[PDB]
Amino acid sequence: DAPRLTGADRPMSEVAAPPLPETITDDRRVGRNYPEQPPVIPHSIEGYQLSVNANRCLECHRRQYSGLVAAPMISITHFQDREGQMLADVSPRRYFCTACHVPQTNAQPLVTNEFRDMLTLMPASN
Amino acid sequence: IRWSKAPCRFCGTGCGVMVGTRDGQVVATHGDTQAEVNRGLNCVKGYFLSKIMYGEDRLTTPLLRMKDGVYHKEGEFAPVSWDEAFDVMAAQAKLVLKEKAPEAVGMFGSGQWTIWEGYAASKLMRAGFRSNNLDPNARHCMASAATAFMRTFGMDEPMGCYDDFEAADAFVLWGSNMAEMHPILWSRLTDRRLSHEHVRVAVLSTFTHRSSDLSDTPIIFRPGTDRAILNYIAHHIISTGRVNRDFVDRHTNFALGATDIGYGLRPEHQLQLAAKGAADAGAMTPTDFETFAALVSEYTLEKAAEISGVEPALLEELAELYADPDRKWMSLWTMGFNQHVRGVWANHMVYNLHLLTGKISEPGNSPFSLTGQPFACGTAREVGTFAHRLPADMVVTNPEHRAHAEEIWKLPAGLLPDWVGAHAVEQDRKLHDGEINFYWVQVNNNMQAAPNIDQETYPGYRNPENFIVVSDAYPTVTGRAADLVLPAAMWVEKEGAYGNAERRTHFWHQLVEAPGEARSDLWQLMEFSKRFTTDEVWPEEILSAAPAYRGKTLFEVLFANGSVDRFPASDVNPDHANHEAALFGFYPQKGLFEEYAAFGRGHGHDLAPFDTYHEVRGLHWPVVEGEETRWRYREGFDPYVKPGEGLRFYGKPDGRAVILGVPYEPPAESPDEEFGFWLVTGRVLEHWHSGSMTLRWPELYKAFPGAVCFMHPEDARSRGLNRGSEVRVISRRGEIRTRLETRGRNRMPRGVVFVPWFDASQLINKVTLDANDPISRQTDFKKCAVKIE
Numbered sequence: 015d016a017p018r019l020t021g022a023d024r025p026m027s028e029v030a031a032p033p034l035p036e037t038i039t040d041d042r043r044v045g046r047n048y049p050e051q052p053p054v055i056p057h058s059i060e061g062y063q064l065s066v067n068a069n070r071c072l073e074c075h076r077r078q079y080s081g082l083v084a085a086p087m088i089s090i091t092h093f094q095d096r097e098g099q100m101l102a103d104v105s106p107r108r109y110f111c112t113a114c115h116v117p118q119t120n121a122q123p124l125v126t127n128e129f130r131d132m133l134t135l136m137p138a139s140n
Numbered sequence: 141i142r143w144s145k146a147p148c149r150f151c152g153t154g155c156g157v158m159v160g161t162r163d164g165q166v167v168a169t170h171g172d173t174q175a176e177v178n179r180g181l182n183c184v185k186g187y188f189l190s191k192i193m194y195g196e197d198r199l200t201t202p203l204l205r206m207k208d209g210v211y212h213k214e215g216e217f218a219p220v221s222w223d224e225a226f227d228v229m230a231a232q233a234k235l236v237l238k239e240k241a242p243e244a245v246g247m248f249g250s251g252q253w254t255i256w257e258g259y260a261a262s263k264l265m266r267a268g269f270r271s272n273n274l275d276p277n278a279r280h281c282m283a284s285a286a287t288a289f290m291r292t293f294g295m296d297e298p299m300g301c302y303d304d305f306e307a308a309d310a311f312v313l314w315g316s317n318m319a320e321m322h323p324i325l326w327s328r329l330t331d332r333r334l335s336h337e338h339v340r341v342a343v344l345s346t347f348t349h350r351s352s353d354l355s356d357t358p359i360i361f362r363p364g365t366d367r368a369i370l371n372y373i374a375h376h377i378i379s380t381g382r383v384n385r386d387f388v389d390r391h392t393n394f395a396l397g398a399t400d401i402g403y404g405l406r407p408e409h410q411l412q413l414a415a416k417g418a419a420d421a422g423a424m425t426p427t428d429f430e431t432f433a434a435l436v437s438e439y440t441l442e443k444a445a446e447i448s449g450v451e452p453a454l455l456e457e458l459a460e461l462y463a464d465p466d467r468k469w470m471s472l473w474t475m476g477f478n479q480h481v482r483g484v485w486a487n488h489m490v491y492n493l494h495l496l497t498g499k500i501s502e503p504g505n506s507p508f509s510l511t512g513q514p515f516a517c518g519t520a521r522e523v524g525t526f527a528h529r530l531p532a533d534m535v536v537t538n539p540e541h542r543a544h545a546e547e548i549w550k551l552p553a554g555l556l557p558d559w560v561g562a563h564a565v566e567q568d569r570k571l572h573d574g575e576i577n578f579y580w581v582q583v584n585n586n587m588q589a590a591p592n593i594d595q596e597t598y599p600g601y602r603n604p605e606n607f608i609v610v611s612d613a614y615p616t617v618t619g620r621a622a623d624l625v626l627p628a629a630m631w632v633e634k635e636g637a638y639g640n641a642e643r644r645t646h647f648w649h650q651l652v653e654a655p656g657e658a659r660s661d662l663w664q665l666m667e668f669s670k671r672f673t674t675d676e677v678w679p680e681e682i683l684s685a686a687p688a689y690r691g692k693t694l695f696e697v698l699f700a701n702g703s704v705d706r707f708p709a710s711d712v713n714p715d716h717a718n719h720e721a722a723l724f725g726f727y728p729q730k731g732l733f734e735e736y737a738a739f740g741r742g743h744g745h746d747l748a749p750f751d752t753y754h755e756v757r758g759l760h761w762p763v764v765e766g767e768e769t770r771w772r773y774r775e776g777f778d779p780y781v782k783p784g785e786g787l788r789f790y791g792k793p794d795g796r797a798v799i800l801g802v803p804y805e806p807p808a809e810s811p812d813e814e815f816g817f818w819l820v821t822g823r824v825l826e827h828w829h830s831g832s833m834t835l836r837w838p839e840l841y842k843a844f845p846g847a848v849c850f851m852h853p854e855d856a857r858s859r860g861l862n863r864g865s866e867v868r869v870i871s872r873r874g875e876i877r878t879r880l881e882t883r884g885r886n887r888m889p890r891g892v893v894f895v896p897w898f899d900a901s902q903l904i905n906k907v908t909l910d911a912n913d914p915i916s917r918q919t920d921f922k923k924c925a926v927k928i929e
């Protein structure tokens with residue numbers, strides 16, 4: 015965390031760039047404030063490939079059917095196609111997850127955000 | 141508790157969001173399932189719109205450099221009343237407006253301004269201060285595309301629409317990175333590709349990124365060599381005898397472009413002196429179908445391959461797609477082609493492939509130009525917020541247009557200025573030199589966005605003969621580098637309207653109140669008006685001719701015309717407030733919208749009735765009889781095409797689109813022996829431009845805290861560098877210290893490096909070269925030579 019990447023000290027002067035912050039791999043889910051607030055990724059992404067031929071994510075994040083019971087790993091809302099219809103499995107829109115789900119690092123916000131929570135309009139804390 | 145409709149404040153895609161409101165607070169941001177663009181889906185930045193207006197910095201009071209003691213450029217920054225702020229800001233104006241006059245006052249707007257904010261601005265700058273020195277940040281963005289639009293079609297914006305995503309048979313991405321910059325569109329493209337396995341995607345790029353991860357034909361070419369590839373395909377269409385004759389013969393003309401055009405710099409710089417023919421540039425000169433074909437002949441598959449660096453087999457793959465007269469090609473391009481010193485040519489060349497084959501104006505067959513900002517289309521382009529422009533594709537040059545504007549704006553004849561204003565780049569230069577002495581920046585952070593800041597933008601803002609105002613919602617380096625900073629009501633704190641890349645014009649009411657004393661840019665503009673008088677600013681002759689325009693005050697003349705006052709403080713939806721209507725007695729937006737609307741309506745550009753846009757989630761325009769237009773220039777789809785016609789690019793008189801014969805040329809600056817690396821510059825999913833908004837949303841900041849240099853894993857080992865090393869990206873113009881990141885999302889080719897510009901600590905634009913496409917004047921941020929230590 016350096017010269018307010020927001021304000022820039024006496025501009026163009028010459029600034030030292032802090033070292034890359036490290037990703038948070040501690041597998042703890044974080045907790046959101048409103049439905050539809052994309053969960054943050056609590057684990058690593060690194061080697062995971064998302065391409066025309068493979069989607070590493072869908073390997074762990076899926077729902078079991080054929081009569082069996084396992085713990086759900088994606089919400090069924092990820093099954094609806096444009097038009098809201100519910101397909102029998104994750105729909106291709108939604109295939110590239112990296113577009114909505116972001117992992118996180120140890121980085122101190124350069125400024126506090128006074129966004130408030132729906133219940134108890136108290137500044138959000140996750 | 142209370143959900144309101146609203147368009148995403150970022151992307152040119154234009155997703156619909158449903159803002160959740162409680163106790164005067166936005167407490168949630170969901171996807172609008174009733175919106176055609178996205179249909180309930182947003183991307184990271186979208187869902188986090190809820191946290192954008194809430195950083196603890198939000199400017200709340202105007203800040204002048206010295207409250208009392210007077211005001212000194214090299215001062216402090218002090219709180220100051222609005223009145224005070226305007227008092228000082230008006231005085232500075234009046235002066236400049238008498239020592240050097242209009243060609244010395246200048247505005248720099250944005251494709252992030254609301255439709256009526258860019259309209260109120262155009263009006264104020266021209267009908268008011270009588271200066272066409274108004275240019276937008278869109279100059280760095282869509283100029284190239286817009287410029288080629290007029291040249292090839294005689295009318296701006298695409299002829300297709302997002303509906304093509306579902307109809308296409310195969311997609312070609314010319315250097316785009318939709319995966320990260322137009323996610324929901326990339327989602328829409330991905331759904332088509334993955335859902336119908338016959339579909340084929342080809343992505344071309346300077347480096348490997350998240351987008352060429354869905355590609356079937358993955359091509360990585362040499363910076364700037366896309367020009368050659370484009371011609372090869374034309375040649376291939378022609379050589380294999382697969383031109384659509386009935387179409388080319390009936391709907392096409394040809395032409396040749398001026399060839400030794402010269403990297404839009406200052407006369408003095410070598411490249412321009414050498415540029416025999418930089419005086420024209422954009423010279424057309426008709427031709428022959430035969431001559432074009434022969435020009436394109438030089439670019440053999442064997443040659444194109446040599447210049448790009450792509451195995452010929454891939455170029456054969458591309459060529460063919462653009463050719464089997466059944467593959468509905470759907471070419472998409474963003475800043476790759478636009479921020480190109482030969483961008484206008486590139487745009488031209490893509491259309492050629494489509495014109496030659498007749499693949500245009502049909503569902504699925506379309507050359508779609510993706511637009512970047514939320515309303516670079518809706519506002520900058522359509523309202524015409526560029527130095528040389530007026531509403532609905534009209535130019536300041538043309539007298540008939542000038543007159544037409546004058547008739548609608550209720551002005552005295554010959555009032556509007558005929559001179560072309562200073563474009564973005566020029567504006568910085570004229571600032572450096574001392575030609576523009578009063579400057580008003582709005583809804584942009586140009587001190588970070590603009591090219592070569594150290595050479596010509598920074599000194600220009602700090603030039604003591606200059607006074608600089610910056611309206612913004614957060615700190616920002618540009619503001620830090622200004623003299624007067626005015627606080628703005630942002631996004632949903634003000635009622636507004638935007639226009640997305642597919643001609644979709646959508647509105648939003650004011651859902652919450654801005655913090656402290658901040659007010660919409662609309663207000664700022666309109667209020668600052670109340671200071672000048674028809675005497676003061678207009679030429680005496682014009683006055684003599686019309687007494688009622690003596691005293692008055694730019695406001696009675698600009699916003700109290702009895703045209704813009706037309707509608708009462710009522711007429712504003714019982715629910716929903718409007719600070720710009722509580723102050724003032726009319727309803728600005730409705731007035732401005734409906735006035736501005738009269739420029740189009742009839743001559744293409746048909747906007748729907750103001751009120752309609754509030755009840756619906758946008759309508760793509762020419763909205764004729766309340767019916768939107770998906771595909772333009774097609775009988776049946778477009779109503780401006782007369783029954784017995786078929787197609788008719790009615791922007792052109794003869795109704796034929798131009799095919800330009802143009803030659804590949806090289807970039808302004810290529811790597812040397814001293815500076816061996818290519819400096820590519822761009823963006824990242826998590827951040828929007830300057831990061832003034834996203835770097836404040838915690839999850840986005842945390843997700844990618846600061847800028848980084850993407851490099852090849854081996855180009856690092858060699859220099860004895862590892863991942864995380866603090867490097868110096870160096871140019872003949874500047875240096876940065878970013879940290880190296882190899883093994884990141886962007887997998888660089890040897891000799892190419894990429895750094896995103898969202899970090900103000902890391903101003904890459906100090907490193908960047910000032911070069912533009914000499915026709916559109918759009919600076920090129922995608923390539924220059926850089927060294928790393």
Ligand SMILES: Nc1nc2c(c(=O)[nH]1)N[C@H]1C(S)=C(S)[C@@H](COP(=O)(O)OP(=O)(O)OC[C@H]3O[C@@H](n4cnc5c(=O)[nH]c(N)nc54)[C@H](O)[C@@H]3O)O[C@H]1N2
Binds near residue numbers: 282513588629822
């Ligand atoms: N190196 C490099 N530079 C580039 C480019 C590139 O590819 N590489 N891209 C270019 C392109 S395509 C573009 S579009 C430009 C974008 O460049 P800018 O227009 O400078 O980009 P933003 O940072 O979004 O600036 C928006 C400003 O709006 C402020 N803001 C937010 N809401 C409001 C409001 O309601 N009112 C006011 N007055 N301010 C508000 C924010 O704090 C911010 O300062 O950058 C260009 N510069």
Ligand SMILES: Nc1nc2c(c(=O)[nH]1)N[C@H]1C(S)=C(S)[C@@H](COP(=O)(O)OP(=O)(O)OC[C@H]3O[C@@H](n4cnc5c(=O)[nH]c(N)nc54)[C@H](O)[C@@H]3O)O[C@H]1N2
Binds near residue numbers: 281
């Ligand atoms: N997350 C996020 N998304 C955004 C924005 C944002 O601030 N944040 N900005 C929006 C705006 S205003 C805009 S203008 C768009 C920009 O969208 P893009 O143009 O997709 O954005 P960039 O990331 O700048 O990507 C630079 C691109 O340059 C290509 N390129 C480099 N050199 C050349 C060349 O010589 N020829 C060609 N053909 N391509 C070349 C590279 O392959 C790369 O894909 O993004 C929009 N999307």
Ligand code: HEC
Binds near residue numbers: 050051087104111
């Ligand atoms: C936007 C178009 C998305 C894409 C692509 C993906 N996800 Fe998602 N996801 C999205 C939202 C808006 C939400 C809701 C957040 C809320 O607070 O209500 C989610 C949620 C998830 C979850 C959490 C499920 C739960 O029941 O709590 C998971 C595990 C998840 N998403 C997984 C996931 C995967 C694997 C994806 C790629 C195939 C993916 N999502 C894409 C939005 C979007």
Ligand code: HEC
Binds near residue numbers: 044072074
């Ligand atoms: C197997 C290891 C994987 C793979 C390949 C991916 N994820 Fe993850 N993920 C995994 C676990 C065990 C958990 C915790 C599960 C639980 O408590 O039930 C997660 C969690 C997430 C979350 C947060 C979910 C929440 O808060 O409810 C997200 C957003 C997430 N995973 C995303 C994600 C993406 C995008 C992936 C592909 C790059 C991906 N995961 C792969 C285990 C695994």
Ligand code: SF4
Binds near residue numbers: 155183184186322
């Ligand atoms: S794709 Fe663009 S408009 Fe849609 S939510 Fe993401 S940023 Fe916003």
Ligand SMILES: [Mo]
Binds near residue numbers: 281282511513
């Ligand atoms: Mo842009």
